[PDB]
């Protein structure tokens, strides 16, 4: 249902979106997550947009990811300006019920998955 793309091998600094493409029916009555998994690391939580398009950030991730949906389209993306080496990893898209509040962050709120898309950041 979930389709990533946009992943390959990008400059430092520079800036890059990533799509998320939902199959079948109508997307926009889901809250929109992103997740990343960096090389080593367990899952970490990047933003999320609910169905009102209210952002939440993550507590840690310091204001630095963009979330827009575009209902018109079954897609929500995700833009990282000023790409650091440490941005390196499995980017998922994922689909709630929930809605916007701090339940937003744990990835056990969501309930399907992409299949995930490879952001190398290199010089």
């Known amino acids: 249902q979930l389709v990533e793309s946009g992943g390959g091998l990008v400059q430092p600094g520079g800036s890059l979106r990533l799509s998320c493409a939902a199959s079948?029916?109508?997307?926009?009555?889901?809250?929109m997550g992103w997740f990343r998994q960096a090389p080593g690391k367990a899952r970490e939580f990047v933003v999320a947009?609910?169905?009102?398009?209210?952002?939440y950030d993550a507590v840690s991730l310091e204001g630095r990811f963009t979330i827009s949906r575009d209902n018109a389209k079954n897609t929500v993306y995700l833009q990282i300006n000023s790409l650091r080496p440490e941005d390196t990893a499995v980017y998922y898209c994922?689909?709630?019920?929930?809605?916007?509040?701090?339940?937003?962050?744990?990835?056990?709120?969501?309930?399907?998955w992409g299949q995930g898309t490879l952001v190398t950041v290199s010089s």
């Open positions: 994922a689909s709630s019920r929930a809605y916007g509040s701090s339940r937003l962050r744990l990835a056990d709120t969501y309930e399907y």
């Open positions: 079948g029916r109508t997307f926009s009555s889901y809250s």
């Open positions: 947009i609910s169905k009102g398009g209210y952002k």
